Design a protein around this ligand. Structure first.
Ligand SMILES: O=C(O)CCC(=O)C(=O)O
Ligand code: NA
Ligand code: NI
Ligand SMILES: [Sr+2]
Ligand SMILES: [Sr+2]
Length: 311
């Protein structure tokens, strides 16, 4: 798993990011310019949030129950559950996610965010601005690696910025060791902050799941299915999963950037050529999203209906 220092020479960064995108669809970045103090404060906010009493968490349960990952995927803050498991043949546990949009930060959106812990809005608004800035920088390195003009993705293709704070209860003897099953992210690009082992990447060419080392001040970058399609498979998407920790409750902070639901997705036209014919026909992001969220029969079930020029 490449670890890319963003204070190296510009051209080296472009070259290393491009190779990682071609080879794996996942890499880590260090010396990335986001304040370490802000990364630590954001993790502390989520530790404090997930430790709040059940009565506080009811504020994020629409109509009194957790949300599910199904359309419409709203931007107002909600608690989501998934993946029920049995621990020690005794207690049930699940994967909890607090998720909300971040951009644009409309007053109506901000007022859906937690107000306890009391530093939530200040810390997480600052965090979201910094992580978006880093994401857009990485997308520009990707533009240069693909041969596209800088700023290609600075439009409706990055209109949605979802923050997903995941909480994985520990279990030493779980019904299943996987707390989050293997998936591609459906969006364009994701930045993930972690501080505890559990994230693994599927090396498809080697049919092997390998650890993504936790570096608490780094960001893990993983390319989503939308970028796999837009790059016409010149870049890989990342298939990744999370293993429940035996001892510690694990928290990760994901920033998932991607298109609006009114967007049409297709391979970037300027890169298509006679020897690089399009491998997907254009499709509505919202129709893709419905399939992506519903059909788990294959990792790329969401885009299978749109594949073309298959040989
Ligand atoms: O918890 C993690 O490290 C991964 C989270 C993830 O893959 C997701 O939310 O899409
Ligand atoms: Na625990
Ligand atoms: Ni993911
Ligand atoms: Sr409830
Ligand atoms: Sr092998």
């Amino acid at each position: 798993v490449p670890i890319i220092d963003l204070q190296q020479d510009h051209l080296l960064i472009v070259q290393q990011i491009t190779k990682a995108c071609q080879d794996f669809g996942l890499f880590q970045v260090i010396n990335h310019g986001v304040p370490e103090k802000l990364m630590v404060e954001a993790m502390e906010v989520y530790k404090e949030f997930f430790a709040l009493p059940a009565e506080e968490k009811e504020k994020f349960q629409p109509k009194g129950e957790p949300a599910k990952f199904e359309l419409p995927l709203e931007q107002k803050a909600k608690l989501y559950v998934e993946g029920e498991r049995r621990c020690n043949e005794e207690f049930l546990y699940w994967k909890d996610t607090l998720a909300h949009g971040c951009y644009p930060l409309h007053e109506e959106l901000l007022n859906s965010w937690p107000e306890k812990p009391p530093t939530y809005r200040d810390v997480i608004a600052k965090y979201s601005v910094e992580v978006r800035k880093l994401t857009m920088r990485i997308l520009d390195y990707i533009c240069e690696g693909l041969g596209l003009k800088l700023g290609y993705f600075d439009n409706e293709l990055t209109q949605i910025q979802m923050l997903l704070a995941n909480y994985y209860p520990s279990c030493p003897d779980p019904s299943t060791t996987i707390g989050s099953g293997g998936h591609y992210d459906g969006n364009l690009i994701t930045l993930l902050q972690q501080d505890l082992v559990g994230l693994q990447q599927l090396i498809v060419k080697d049919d092997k799941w390998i650890a993504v080392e936790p570096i608490p001040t780094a960001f893990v970058v993983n390319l989503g299915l939308t970028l796999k399609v837009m790059s016409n498979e010149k870049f890989e998407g990342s298939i990744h999963r999370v293993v429940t920790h035996p001892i510690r409750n694990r928290i990760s902070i994901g920033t998932l950037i991607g298109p609006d639901y009114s967007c049409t997705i297709e391979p970037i036209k300027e890169l298509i050529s006679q020897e690089n014919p399009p491998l997907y026909k254009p499709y509505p992001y919202a129709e893709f999203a419905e399939i992506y969220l519903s059909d788990k029969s294959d990792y790329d079930a969401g885009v299978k209906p749109y594949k073309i020029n298959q040989f």
